[PDB]
Design a protein around this ligand. Sequence first.
Ligand SMILES: O=[N+]([O-])c1ccc2nn[nH]c2c1
Length: 304
Amino acid sequence: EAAQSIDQLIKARGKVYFGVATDQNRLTTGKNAAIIKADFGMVWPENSMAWDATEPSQGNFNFAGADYLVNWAQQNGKLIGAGCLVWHNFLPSWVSSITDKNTLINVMKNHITTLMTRYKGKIRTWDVVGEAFNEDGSLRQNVFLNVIGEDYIPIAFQTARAADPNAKLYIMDYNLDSASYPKTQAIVNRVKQWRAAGVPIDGIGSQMHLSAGQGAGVLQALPLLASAGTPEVSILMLDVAGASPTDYVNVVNACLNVQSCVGITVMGVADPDSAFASSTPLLFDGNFNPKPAYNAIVQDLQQI
Ligand SMILES: O=[N+]([O-])c1ccc2nn[nH]c2c1
């Protein structure tokens, strides 16, 4: 049927992409590769770029999984996003146990530089820092904050910019879906401050793991995120419990409404492959058929 690719359609509305998280296992099973080829314009590593996947012991990197994704995307004419370079998730014990500031700075910089160098010029977007905020808006006391202090964030970004000046560098977080929530306000205020200091934060990414009914709030939250003045914002990790068309369409329209929002990435293709499968929160069902939300996004994006 005509005009059924949400990536094609969103590009026709002036956005950069509709993306999806994937990896080698997905691409070689199910109908994921077919759907991604037809319907999506950008891919991200669901897991293969995580620190645990990529640097399981100090200085010793594992690239096979990430290489597969990058190669597949290149072969299929897809943009690539990657991350997360610095966050509290998926950290090897060898990182978490470091207590010396200069050591951890250099570990972090080597992790950033190594990964970004390997894929230099190939990656549109890097999520450099993730999940840096507490729910109250204070900085999360992860190993980086505890050992390095708050400079870890400027250092990460500056390191990333040096490693691959072509990439757009993002900070990302979750629970940025309500404009009145302290975390949402805080990331804006801190990103403004960091950018005023010359930190090269090109984007804020909103990890939109949503419960039912939360789409509507994003119409206010996304404009708020864009007010930090980054050149870009994006929607990441999108899924919605229940997959209501109302929620999905509100999210998409938030993207359309926000000039600086470049695109939307969904957390996966088909429901059974979600970490939240019982909430059937994705755009394709367990037989790989598009769900009502997919079709509602198509109608919303269709336009002489
Ligand atoms: O948007 N994404 O779905 C997504 C998935 C994994 C990631 N790791 N870093 N950034 C990511 C974005």
